[PDB]
Design a protein around this nucleic acid. Structure first.
Ligand SMILES: [Zn+2]
Ligand SMILES: [Zn+2]
Lengths: 56, 96, 77, 91, 135, 251
RNA sequence: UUUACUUAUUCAAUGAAGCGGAGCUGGAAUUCAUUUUCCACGUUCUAGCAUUCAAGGUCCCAUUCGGGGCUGAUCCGGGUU
RNA sequence: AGAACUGGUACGGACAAGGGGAAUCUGACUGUCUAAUUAAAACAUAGCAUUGCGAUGGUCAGAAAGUGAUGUUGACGCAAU
RNA sequence: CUUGUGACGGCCCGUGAAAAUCCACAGGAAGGAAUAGUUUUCAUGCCAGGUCGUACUGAUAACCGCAGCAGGUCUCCAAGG
RNA sequence: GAUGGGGAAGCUCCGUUUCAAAGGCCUGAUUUUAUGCAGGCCACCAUCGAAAGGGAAUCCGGUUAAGAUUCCGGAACCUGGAUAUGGAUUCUUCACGGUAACGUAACUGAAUGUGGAGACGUCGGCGCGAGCCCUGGGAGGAGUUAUCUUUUCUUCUUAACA
């Protein structure tokens, strides 16, 4: 129960990972991949936009 | 057509299905081509696009579903992805 | 109300300096039919918990009481 | 074996409520209890939770739709004509 | 074409160092004996260096450009690669399987990469790598 | 005589709608800056049954551009939306399902729902299951749009008036029977105390204007003037014709 | 009888946030002389993330631990719409 | 489940525990009511049909009111029959 | 047998309370070392924990029915054949 | 159901976040001192409302003429607040091991934001557990006994908490 969560120490409450005791580890994986992929996509989109409109 | 060439590859060439074996082959560089079903996750799709960008392998997007591609290769289950390692007989690598 | 096995842990416990009381229980026991042994139980009492050093050797038991302090108020039973 | 000639799922309703209403209910109960295909994963794990809540257990998704079927034909027409005019407008 | 080459940048997704950016230095692509699978020795960051401005005079600057790096054996399936690259001369010698199973060797490897990372970051280089992956 | 049922339903002690199991109102986000200068993205996070309604709702999430928070909204789901979906809403948005383009922007022949009546009422028209509004034509000079409403009604409303694209979900609902006073019980007990309906002609004349008589008969004709009063307006009110209609709505 | 003005009255929102005008910066406009006016005037494969008067640039200070102003974010009118 | 043997043919041994059939009238059903003379063929019911209403509104309320119920609603809906 | 729970399954035009409280996570403000500090989510040790109720019946005699009225009045436990 | 506000001859009515200037924090600066004061944050918008909903924390034994989870003995738990020793970390300043799932005695973390528990139907059968019931042997006690009954009955228990 919640007050018992307040009794116990950290080891019993979360995990040593980023997003320890909030999100599933597989979801952590998924969203990390999503971040990296779409920011790379953003970058290539930005540069193709810049160069085509620089030609134009 | 494309399903006919893919059956030819099933008979002559060789391949591996599914994300895990596919990306393993792609890490090893042993693959040449991928066909990817439209229905499968855009994340998985984009990740494979990145992997194949690194490997310089070729990619093709299948006008169908995991079911359709499975029927094409001649198997009876879901296939979101297939990796062609070599065809031998087919014009797959040449066309598209 | 915690088991204890480490004897030097029990000794520094006796000198934890909140400890004031101690007890030694004897128990008639059975390992086997023909050697019903004598279990010794050193139950030491301080503030927040009682620590029970368990023993099944009378030689070690005697040695322990020889090692203990005299001022720690004991109860033999 | 073969249980029922023509009442099917409407034999739990027994001898009540009139044959015609039992027919209509039969049709729609079949539609609403049936399993459908999640477009995303092609699998047959789609079911109604509630009226116009059609969720897929395998791919953990939910789509809004008809109370008894998952894609109503009106909305199909709407999808098609939307794609039509949208293609035209971007064109 | 394989690309798990020993100068690479990759993105650790699974484990205590997840969501991190490591550099790949020693790929055992064709398996091993103790970690028998497609695996590597890599190294990266455990605590990124913070953003820095003009406002900081030297003390916050040093404190913020500190690094806590790490080394790790990992499965390629538990890695994500990139296209980016990095220079690997300063530690490709000291790093090895024998650098592991000896925490004295570990700490020494951590000491030099810190120096090897701090200067390449103190130089305005590899900004994408020394940055953070937010998510 | 005596006060009668509608004449008590006004006061509304036991006739108030029931609210315990509703997620609050379903409404369109405020026409603040972006939806009238551009667009904004939101994520359909989940879809949920609302009790007493017949349609489902969409728990959608936007981001307040002025403050670091996530502002949540409850929309009505059209057929074709789903979870984890990107809903773009505003003026410079795209003509797909879920989006909230203005009626000034959409073309003729278009389908919309949850349509506003004046910009900043945040969802009035065609909010129920399977009900859609069709566009007819514009008068952009003096910006107005003609729309056909499920009653067949050709209304004229402004152009900045937003409206969601698609057909409202949960259609076909009344195609099914109920078969059971219990099914109807459950329906109306989550909506409001509105059932069973008992007949005035079976009541006593104190209790209704039909009640009484040795035979259950109305006696005096049930077509009631609109300019009648509170106590007389039992029956068919302001009616133009009665009986079985054979032919066409003729509009 | 028709319509015009907003301020009176009335309606509705809103934590009263991006009103209006003019203007850059581009596209079209035919400019018949210089612009005549019109469009935009940072976002759409993906269930990520976006916060610390913003980083930068720039001018000062009392350099020191750091502190402050302009821009970054056009200007005017203070009619919330 | 079955077979021998047995009994003053008794044996679901007490307790417990459906009377049925052929037809009519009537209401479809389950359900609810006249507490303390009427439980019914009455009410309800699902289903059928009609009527009003596009929110500056319909129905209803309130001494009024910057008041209110339907309405955390919007014609597959609310209201009245 | 009574019960408690776990995963499953069926039903719904019905999908079956809220708030307090607590915890983690993201974030990286602030501060921290070498003879030092750092942390009081590790162990151990110290003090204090107020207010009001608290007996009994709970019914063919403790309640309401003018009463020591064959009435009525919410619930838990529930052996053997 | 107050206040603000509006109604009402008026007793009072509406309405409960609304057309309101509806406030109270963290930080340091004053270490003449107040809390003025440098700073920035935020934005309930009263309150009342369940001895069956939610809820921080206790159990056994014994005890009285009449009390008991309340008393006595023993063993525990939480909350709040001071708090010191030990331990861990660190000269690479804010731990390490594990491929991973994750593990440990601990092992910085403000503003703000995100998520979760609280927090949840009903019925079916299935499994699992608790207590009970049935029961075997053995150790004690009691009963029956013209006859027969290695017999019928009975005690053989172990709480919170760690
Ligand atoms: Zn998860
Ligand atoms: Zn699916």
């Amino acid at each position: 129960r919640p007050r018992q969560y307040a009794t116990v120490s950290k080891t019993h409450k979360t995990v040593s990972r980023a997003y320890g005791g909030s999100r599933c580890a597989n979801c952590v994986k998924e969203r990390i991949i999503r971040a990296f992929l779409i920011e790379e996509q953003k970058i290539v989109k930005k540069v193709v936009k810049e160069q085509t409109e620089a030609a134009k | 057509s494309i399903n006919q060439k893919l059956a030819l590859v099933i008979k002559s060439g060789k391949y591996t299905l599914g994300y895990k074996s596919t990306v393993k082959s792609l890490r090893q560089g042993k693959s040449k081509l991928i066909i990817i079903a439209a229905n499968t996750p855009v994340l998985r799709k984009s990740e494979l696009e990145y992997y194949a960008m690194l490997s310089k392998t070729k990619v093709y997007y299948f006008q169908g579903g995991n079911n359709e591609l499975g029927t094409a290769v001649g198997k009876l289950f879901r296939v979101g992805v297939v990796s062609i390692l070599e065809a031998g007989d087919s014009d797959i690598l040449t066309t598209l | 109300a915690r088991e204890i096995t480490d004897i030097k842990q029990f000794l520094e416990l006796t000198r934890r300096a909140d400890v004031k009381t101690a007890t030694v229980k004897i128990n008639k026991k059975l390992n086997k039919a023909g050697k019903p042994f004598r279990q010794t139980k050193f139950k030491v009492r301080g503030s927040s918990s009682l620590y029970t050093l368990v023993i099944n050797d009378a030689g070690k038991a005697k040695k322990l009481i020889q090692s203990l302090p005299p001022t720690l108020k004991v109860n033999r039973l | 074996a073969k249980r029922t000639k023509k009442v099917g799922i409407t034999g739990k309703y027994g001898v009540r409520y009139g044959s015609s209403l039992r027919r209509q209910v039969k049709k729609l109960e079949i539609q609403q209890h049936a399993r459908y295909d999640c477009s995303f994963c092609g699998k047959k794990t789609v079911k109604r939770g509630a009226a116009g809540i059609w969720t897929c257990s395998c791919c953990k998704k939910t789509v809004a739709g008809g109370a008894y079927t998952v894609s109503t034909a009106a909305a199909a027409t709407v999808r098609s004509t939307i794609r039509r005019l949208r293609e035209m407008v971007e064109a | 074409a394989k690309f798990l080459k020993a100068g690479k940048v990759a993105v650790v997704v699974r484990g205590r160092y997840a969501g991190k950016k490591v550099v790949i230095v020693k790929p055992h692509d064709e398996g091993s004996k103790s970690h028998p699978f497609g695996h590597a020795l890599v190294a990266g960051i455990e605590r990124y260096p913070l953003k820095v401005t003009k406002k900081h005079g030297a003390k916050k600057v040093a404190k913020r450009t500190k690094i806590k790096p790490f080394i790790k054996v990992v499965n390629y399936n538990h890695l994500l690669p990139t296209r980016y690259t990095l220079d690997v001369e300063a530690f490709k010698s000291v790093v090895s399987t024998e650098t592991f199973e000896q925490p004295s060797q570990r700490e020494e490897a951590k000491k030099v990469v810190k120096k090897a990372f701090e200067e390449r970051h103190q130089a305005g280089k590899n900004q994408w790598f020394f940055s953070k992956l937010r998510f | 005589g005596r006060v009668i049922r509608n004449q008590r339903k006004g006061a509304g002690s036991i006739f108030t709608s029931h609210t315990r199991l509703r997620q609050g109102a379903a409404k369109l986000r405020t026409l603040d800056y972006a939806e009238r200068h551009g667009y904004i993205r939101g994520i359909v996070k989940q879809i949920v049954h609302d009790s007493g309604r017949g349609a489902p709702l969409a728990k959608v999430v936007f981001r307040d551009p002025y403050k670091y928070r996530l502002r949540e909204e409850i929309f009505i789901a059209n057929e074709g939306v789903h979870t984890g979906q990107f809903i773009y809403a505003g003026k410079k948005a795209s003509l797909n399902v879920g989006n909230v383009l203005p009626l000034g922007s959409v073309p003729e022949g278009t389908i919309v729902s949850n349509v506003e009546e004046k910009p900043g009422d945040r969802g009035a028209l065609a909010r129920a299951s399977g009900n859609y509004v069709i566009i007819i034509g514009h008068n952009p000079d003096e910006n107005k749009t003609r729309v056909r409403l499920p009653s067949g009604a050709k209304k004229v409303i402004s152009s900045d008036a937003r409206g969601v694209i698609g057909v409202i979900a949960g259609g076909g609902r009344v195609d099914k029977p109920l078969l059971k006073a219990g099914r109807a019980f459950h329906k109306y007990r989550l909506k409001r105390n509105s059932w069973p309906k008992t007949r005035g002609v079976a009541m006593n004349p104190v209790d209704h204007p039909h009640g009484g008589g040795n035979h259950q008969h109305i006696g005096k004709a049930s077509t009631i003037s609109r300019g009648a009063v509170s106590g007389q307006k039992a029956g068919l009110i302001a009616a133009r014709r009665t009986g079985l209609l054979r032919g066409s709505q003729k509009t």
